[PDB]
Amino acid sequence: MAAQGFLLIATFLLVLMVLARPLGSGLARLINDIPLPGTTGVERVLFRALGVSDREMNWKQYLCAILGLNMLGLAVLFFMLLGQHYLPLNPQQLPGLSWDLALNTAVSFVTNTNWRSYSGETTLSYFSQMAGLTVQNFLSAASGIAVIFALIRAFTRQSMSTLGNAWVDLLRITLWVLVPVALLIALFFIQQGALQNFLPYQAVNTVEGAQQLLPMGPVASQEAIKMLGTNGGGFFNANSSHPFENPTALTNFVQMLAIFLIPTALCFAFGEVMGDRRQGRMLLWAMSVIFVICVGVVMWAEVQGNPHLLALGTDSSINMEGKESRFGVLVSSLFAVVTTAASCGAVIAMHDSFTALGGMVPMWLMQIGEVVFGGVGSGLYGMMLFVLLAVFIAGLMIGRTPEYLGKKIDVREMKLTALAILVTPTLVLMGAALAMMTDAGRSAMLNPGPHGFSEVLYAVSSAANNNGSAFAGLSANSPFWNCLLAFCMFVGRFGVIIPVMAIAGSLVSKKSQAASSGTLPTHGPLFVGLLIGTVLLVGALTFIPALALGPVAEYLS
Amino acid sequence: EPTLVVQALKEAVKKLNPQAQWRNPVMFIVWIGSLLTTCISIAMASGAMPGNALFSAAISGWLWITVLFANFAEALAEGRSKAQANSLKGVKKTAFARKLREPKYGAAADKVPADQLRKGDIVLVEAGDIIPCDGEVIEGGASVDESAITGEAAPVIRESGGDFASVTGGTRILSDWLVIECSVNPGETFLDRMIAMVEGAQRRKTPNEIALTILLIALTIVFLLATATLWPFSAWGGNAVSVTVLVALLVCLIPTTIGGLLSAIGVAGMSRMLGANVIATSGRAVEAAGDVDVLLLDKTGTITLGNRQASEFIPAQGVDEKTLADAAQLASLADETPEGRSIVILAKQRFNLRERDVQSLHATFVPFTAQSRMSGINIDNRMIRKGSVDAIRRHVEANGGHFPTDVDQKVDQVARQGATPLVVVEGSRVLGVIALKDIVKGGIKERFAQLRKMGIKTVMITGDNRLTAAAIAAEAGVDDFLAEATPEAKLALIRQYQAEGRLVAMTGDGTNDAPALAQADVAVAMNSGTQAAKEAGNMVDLDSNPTKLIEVVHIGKQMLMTRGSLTTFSIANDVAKYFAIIPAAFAATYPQLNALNIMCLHSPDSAILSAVIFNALIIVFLIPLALKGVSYKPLTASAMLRRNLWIYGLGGLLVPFIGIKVIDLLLTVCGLV
Amino acid sequence: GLRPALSTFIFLLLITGGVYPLLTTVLGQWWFPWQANGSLIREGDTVRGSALIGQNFTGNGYFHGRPSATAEMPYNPQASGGSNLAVSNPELDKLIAARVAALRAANPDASASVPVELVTASASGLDNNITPQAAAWQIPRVAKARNLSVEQLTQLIAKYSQQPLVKYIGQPVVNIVELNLALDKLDE
Amino acid sequence: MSAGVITGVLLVFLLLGYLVYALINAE
Ligand SMILES: CCCCCCCC/C=C/CCCCCCCC(=O)OC[C@H](COP(=O)(O)OCCN)OC(=O)CCCCCCCCCCCCCCC
Ligand SMILES: Nc1ncnc2c1ncn2[C@@H]1O[C@H](COP(=O)(O)OP(=O)(O)CP(=O)(O)O)[C@@H](O)[C@H]1O
Ligand SMILES: [K+]
Ligand SMILES: [K+]
Ligand SMILES: [Mg+2]
Structure with missing residues (x-):
């Protein structure tokens, strides 16, 4: 089993890099405002028709463009969900969402969380899932990728004042990186058993004579984009464990590869745009180390399973409870760590049922900040926040001014990165305290004991970190929970993107020094381990007391 | 010294005011935590709250000792700086001053208080008296003793109209007299600059300091939220943890070590700087x-001793030594620079014939200029110049004159010997070259051997x-x-x-x-x-x-080293302190967590006590590290990072484990808790 | 300058929301109509279920699947829920004990050790897959129920199995719906 | 929401505001 699990991790990472470097080169071309081969002819007219005039934007204009697009996105999705009944492709005559559910869902998909407090086969219609959630999957992924595009531009450009064009970046990303890749993935899912149609719900007269109403809908399109853009927005209650959303283990493998594809490609593109592949390799090396160790811990924990199963007279202690038969325990453990490390949110195995340790590590991969192959864009600039912090403490220790890629990091940049690192954990801790202090927040706990607090903490932490995973036992359809999580998600995403764009704006203006003798090389196992320890110490010391009363307490019980 | 320790302790007691602590947020959170825990202690001892009162009194007392030790580090550093400032201020005292009526030497001088001197006055200082104020020398040349400002009994020459005409107030002249002009006002003298460097209330934080302080504040916010939100979590899990234990956990997790020692590191840095004669x-x-x-x-005065002396006069062709030295002396009379004075002295020892009066020559003096790089005299229908090689070449070319080949050969030879060769030209004929050799100052060459070891390049x-540049370069x-x-x-x-x-x-x-x-x-x-x-x-x-x-560089590096290292130490310290507080604070809500105690402490009370006691004592144990800095060795960036992390990153992990255990064992043997 | 912001949003809205799913649906219905329609199993005019979604089997003569904690009744696609009960939650122990007792009472000619797959619920609750070992555990029950030989029953279990390409990306699984329907075929 | 928790949350909020203000500033 251990051998099997190691083989699975190795194959996953191997195929991941093999697919990541090509797309990394293409994304690098987009980062340098160099059109893709053969697309220049059509971009000329598309931008001419839309009004995007390749006019450079500063960090203020760029941030305002991204924010404006997301604002209009959530306004449109909010009203679409409210007026869900007055819209076409309504095979099931269901009512529009309430104000709280509409608000939470709109903020969930715009904010690239896709947190869900509903059942997508009962609640949402085909139009909301097609023109409301899928569109926001694309646009949210594109917003995150545009933010990291501008940050990488700030690192590579010399004494400039602009960060490119936000409209050009969004258009190019969503038309050539997200639409065709997701099209390829969606067609593959359809061929392996996914659902892509606009029929009404089918009636099954079961073999043994029961009535089973089968849900239909365009599931493959949303599945390709929810996995590629690390949205995690499931078409049904069961997110990626539904046989229609994830029919075979082959689709599951491709889904995990899709979750990590763009983040890895954006690291390769980061290394290639800066003119030093060692930097991208360094960044990936660190994220891969933490990822592999976490997968190993979760795998072993779930293999250890539940002692009560063996005491009650089963074959083994293997914790199948919140697992599927298609994917083994090892596959489910890997997917748990993948979806919670990449900020995807796609849960193929009910995390509430995982072992205490098994659910601890995913929780803690969200809480650290989603910096381990993190969200699409989100993960890389979170990790860049953590890199700045590491470079600071490193150059501080060696007696030289903080310098990363030759850009000196000074006071103002330090304020910005500190505030950005504080946004997420502040939300986690404050929201969890608010939930555990109100009767409406505690009543949602399905499992008693420490695991109930673990549910609350996991929910708020996933929301604040834009992951979207949830223990799924906590009932968050209440208005209090909807509003709390909506606030947490909104602040997480946008209050982290604002200071990141300020970092970019402050970094374009600076110049980059050459590689002097004393310049600390940020590439290599020394700095790799320094970055790992930075993220891990700060991550542990922030959430150890919270994790102590939740998963650790349940483990030692 | 004992006096400076008791004095710094008194100042630390006096810094306990919140106004003084408002400026350091790290220790201000500790101050407020300590305040609410002593408030809880007095209230619960009176009977206004449940639970043990002596435990809260002990915790709050040790938190007061934490802020006291932070202020003690800060005060000790400032005291050790203030003492140096005292010594320098004592040296600043001057007996009296004597100002002359006319600028020329030999006029009538009257006794005037030194404090009454103002900018523009001309003061005379004879052998025995001390310099009243700073300024530049306008007439005379003599060797003054700068031991009062540099602590070195070696004398130094001071001549007028040159690069060595700068006098510092407080020095003592004993070889001859000098006429100087004070171009500085009271309060801006060089001696007061040292006080400006050392005295407090005007030493703002450095950019790196502010960045690190931002980091400490960021962490403090993190831990404040963690500990503050621990109360509702545990409250749902059962009996809520006492606010006393939460304040203990807060002050433990806060970077109090570096928080308290940051100001001390800066001050010590500037003391060490003054101690290194900078x-x-x-x-x-x-x-x-x-x-x-x-x-x-700078080749002259920085790598060389300065005031190069003329050695010999070398003629080129069809030019007697007498004519050459005579013309060089006449051209050097208008050159108040040490070069001209030395040329004249050499002519004196060589011939010593005749005397010069500007009126007897009826010719204006041509002063030496850095742009012209040549000086001379303009006698009756005669233009005489003297300068560097390129300068003389330009002038002789502008006058339709050519340079002899043997002149160039002799100049090349003298330059190969390492002496700055100067050429003198009378009208349109080059007389010859002057040898202006100089002594190297200090064991420079040996030092640069290790200067280059740390990546610093040297360009002269x-x-x-x-060729003379290449020679001294060598x-x-x-x-x-x-x-x-x-x-x-x-x-x-x-x-x-x-x-x-x-x-x-x-x-x-x-x-x-x-x-x-x-x-x-x-x-x-x-x-x-x-x-x-x-x-x-x-x-x-x-x-x-x-x-x-x-x-x-050593000092600056050390400063940043200490900053970053103490940071690594502090965050590493938090891990161990978790292992002491976590199983102790929730011993009554989640007994299962008692197995999570790896240090095998005695009791929850004692575990939290040991945590707070260590948090307080590790500031005192790091006071000397903060004052002396981190004795770093000359390494590369990656190796220096490796060493700093291996020492402090792992020290901050292992030191608190052993230290908390050592303190817990001491409490367990003494029977306190 | 909101003209680009509105034009870009509407253009990407139309593309990603109308052309992307329209193109995906056209190509899906063109190339893979069966899978795109849900892989339905039809016997005449009535739909007997899907080859991915799992029905609730309680008969003695059919192969039993994993329990489903899905809303009102087990294996209900409308709810698609899983049994979120944690390890420490005693309700999960209660359910596991009751399920072990039920399977042991219904499977007297099997081993006391019950396969962990049949006693623990699934993630989606619509799990139509059990490992060949689990399905093989309940062989004698079905064999006695339908008077089928243990050899051809094993061969049938082996026919409707599905093994991934590589052994470590999933587990061998048996389609319970197709297996039970083929069992009905054979009985006729 | 007793008096103890009211003043506790208030003090936490006040110290958080103090720390954030000091972080934004270069005091
Ligand atoms: C947990 C607390 C404190 C943790 C302190 C642990 C670090 C102690 C360092 C020991 C290393 C001694 C090795 C002995 C020599 C062996 C020879 C060799 O092969 O060296 C190979 C490399 C040398 O790097 P390099 O290639 O040469 O450098 C040129 C590439 N730029 O060593 C390595 O594996 C690198 C492994 C070190 C990474 C572990 C760092 C953990 C996190 C640090 C703490 C962060 C603080 C948080 C900030 C708020
Ligand atoms: N009083 C003087 N009369 C004639 N020539 C002089 C002179 N003082 C300097 N020079 C010429 O000017 C040349 C260069 O002058 P410069 O000031 O730029 O270098 P320096 O050696 O005099 C001081 P440093 O080299 O430390 O900057 C000297 O080497 C000498 O040849
Ligand atoms: K997400
Ligand atoms: K989900
Ligand atoms: Mg000089």
Whole structure:
């Protein structure tokens, strides 16, 4: 089993890099405002028709463009969900969402969380899932990728004042990186058993004579984009464990590869745009180390399973409870760590049922900040926040001014990165305290004991970190929970993107020094381990007391 | 010393006011935590709250000791700085001053208080008296003793109309008299600059300091939220943890170690700087000095002793030695620079015939200028010049004269010997060359051997001949040099280096290099230097040895080293302190967590006590580390990071484990808890 | 300058929301109509279920699947829920004990050790897959129920199995719906 | 929401505001 699990991790990472470097080169071309081969002819007219005039934007204009697009996105999705009944492709005559559910869902998909407090086969219609959630999957992924595009531009450009064009970046990303890749993935899912149609719900007269109403809908399109853009927005209650959303283990493998594809490609593109592949390799090396160790811990924990199963007279202690038969325990453990490390949110195995340790590590991969192959864009600039912090403490220790890629990091940049690192954990801790202090927040706990607090903490932490995973036992359809999580998600995403764009704006203006003798090389196992320890110490010391009363307490019980 | 420890302790007690602590947020959170825990203690002892009162009293008391030890570190540093300032202030006292009526020497002088001196006055100082104020020498030449300002009993020459005409107030003259003019006002003298460097209430935080403080604040916010939100979590899990234990956990997790020691590190840095004979107006330049990769030296006065003396006169062809020395003496009369004075002295010892009066010659004096790089006299229908090789070549070419080949050969030979060769021309015929040899100052070459070890390159900017520049370059053991460089070229070199993203540091002395000094980011202004140079240089060296920047770099590095290392230490410390508080704070809510206690402490009360006691005592145990800095060794970046992390990153993990266990065992043996 | 912001949003809205799913649906219905329609199993005019979604089997003569904690009744696609009960939650122990007792009472000619797959619920609750070992455990029950030989029953279990390409990306699984329907075929 | 928790949350909020203000500033 251990051998099997190691083989699975190795194959996953191997195929991941093999697919990541090509797309990394293409994304690098987009980062340098160099059109893709053969697309220049059509971009000329598309931008001419839309009004995007390749006019450079500063960090203020760029941030305002991204924010404006997301604002209009959530306004449109909010009203679409409210007026869900007055819209076409309504095979099931269901009512529009309430104000709280509409608000939470709109903020969930715009904010690239896709947190869900509903059942997508009962609640949402085909139009909301097609023109409301899928569109926001694309646009949210594109917003995150545009933010990291501008940050990488700030690192590579010399004494400039602009960060490119936000409209050009969004258009190019969503038309050539997200639409065709997701099209390829969606067609593959359809061929392996996914659902892509606009029929009404089918009636099954079961073999043994029961009535089973089968849900239909365009599931493959949303599945390709929810996995590629690390949205995690499931078409049904069961997110990626539904046989229609994830029919075979082959689709599951491709889904995990899709979750990590763009983040890895954006690291390769980061290394290639800066003119030093060692930097991208360094960044990936660190994220891969933490990822592999976490997968190993979760795998072993779930293999250890539940002692009560063996005491009650089963074959083994293997914790199948919140697992599927298609994917083994090892596959489910890997997917748990993948979806919670990449900020995807796609849960193929009910995390509430995982072992205490098994659910601890995913929780803690969200809480650290989603910096381990993190969200699409989100993960890389979170990790860049953590890199700045590491470079600071490193150059501080060696007696030289903080310098990363030759850009000196000074006071103002330090304020910005500190505030950005504080946004997420502040939300986690404050929201969890608010939930555990109100009767409406505690009543949602399905499992008693420490695991109930673990549910609350996991929910708020996933929301604040834009992951979207949830223990799924906590009932968050209440208005209090909807509003709390909506606030947490909104602040997480946008209050982290604002200071990141300020970092970019402050970094374009600076110049980059050459590689002097004393310049600390940020590439290599020394700095790799320094970055790992930075993220891990700060991550542990922030959430150890919270994790102590939740998963650790349940483990030692 | 005992006096400075008791005095700093008294000052630490006096700094307990919240107004004093408002400026340091790290320790301000500790102050407020300590306040609410002593408030809880007094209230619960009175009978207004449940639970044990002596435990809260002990915890709050040790938190008060935490803030007291932080202020003790800060106060001890400031006290050790203030004492040095006291000594220098005592040296500042002057007996009296004597001002003359006319600028010429020999006029009537009257006794006037030294304090009454103002800018523009002309004061005379004879053998025995001390300099009343700073300024520049206008008449006379003598050797003054700068032991009062540098602590070295070695004498130094001071002549008028030259690069060595800068006098410092407080020195003592004993070999002859000097007439100086005080161009400084009361309160702006060089002696008061040292007080400005040492005295507090005007030493703002450095950029790096502010960035690190931002980091500590960020962490403090993190831990504040963690501990503050621990109350509702545990409250749902059962009996809520006591606010006393939460404050203990907060102050333990807060970077109180570096929080308290940060101010002390800065102050100690500036004390060590003064102790190394360097006057740095601001720590910012000292910190920037750590990132310097190219050193810009001055050949004369910085790598060489200065005041080069003439040795011999060499004729070229069809020119008697008498005519050459006579013309050189006449041309040097208008040159108040040490070069001209030495030329005249050599002519004296060689012939010593006749006397010169400007009225008897009816010719205006041509002063020496750095731009002209030549001086001379204009007698009746006669133009006589004397300057460098290129300068004399330009003039003789402008006058339709050619340079003899043997003249060039002799100049090349003298330059190969290492002496700055000067050429003198009468009308349209070159008389010959003068030998202006000089002594190297300090064990420079040996020092640069290890200067280059840490990546600092040395470039000697020189206005002499290529070969003489190359010669001293060799004796100096500098990396590269420049030949026939004017002041604008020196500045241009810094422009070139500063565009490549390389901080340039200028160790120079004369007025000629003043603007280049100012342009460079880091600088070392030699005390054997002019007031314009000093004011324009961030650091003023007193030993006047070009390798003082070595010391500077050592200090600046150390400062940043200590900062970052203590940070690594503090965060590592948090891990162990978790293992002490976590199983203890929730011993009554989740007994299962008691197995999570790995240190095997005695009791929850005692575990939290040991945590707080360690948090307090590790500031005192790091006080000497903060004052002396981190004795780092000259390594590369990756190896230096490796060493700093191996020591402090792992120390901050292992030290608290063993220390908490050691304190818990002491409490367990003493039977306190 | 909101003209680009509105034009870009509407253009990407139309593309990603109308052309992307329209193109995906056209190509899906063109190339893979069966899978795109849900892989339905039809016997005449009535739909007997899907080859991915799992029905609730309680008969003695059919192969039993994993329990489903899905809303009102087990194996209900409308709810698609899983049994979120944690390890420490005693309700999960209660359910596991009751399920072990039920399977042991219904499977007297099997081993006391019950396969962990049949006692623990699934993630989606619509799990139509059990490992060949689990399905093989309940062989004698079905064999006695339908008077089928243990050899051809094993061969049938082996026919409707599905093994991934590589052994470590999933587990061998048996389609319970197709297996039970083929069992009905064979009985006729 | 007793008096103890009211003043506790208030103090936490006040110290958080103090720390954030000091972080934004270069005091
Ligand atoms: C947990 C607390 C404190 C943790 C302190 C642990 C670090 C102690 C360092 C020991 C290393 C001694 C090795 C002995 C020599 C062996 C020879 C060799 O092969 O060296 C190979 C490399 C040398 O790097 P390099 O290639 O040479 O450098 C040129 C590439 N730029 O060593 C390595 O594996 C690198 C492994 C070190 C990474 C572990 C760092 C953990 C996190 C640090 C703490 C962060 C603080 C948080 C900030 C708020
Ligand atoms: N009083 C004087 N009379 C004639 N020539 C002089 C002179 N003083 C200096 N020179 C010439 O000017 C040349 C270069 O002058 P410059 O000041 O630029 O270098 P320097 O050696 O005199 C001071 P440094 O080299 O430390 O900057 C000297 O080497 C000498 O040849
Ligand atoms: K997400
Ligand atoms: K989900
Ligand atoms: Mg000079």
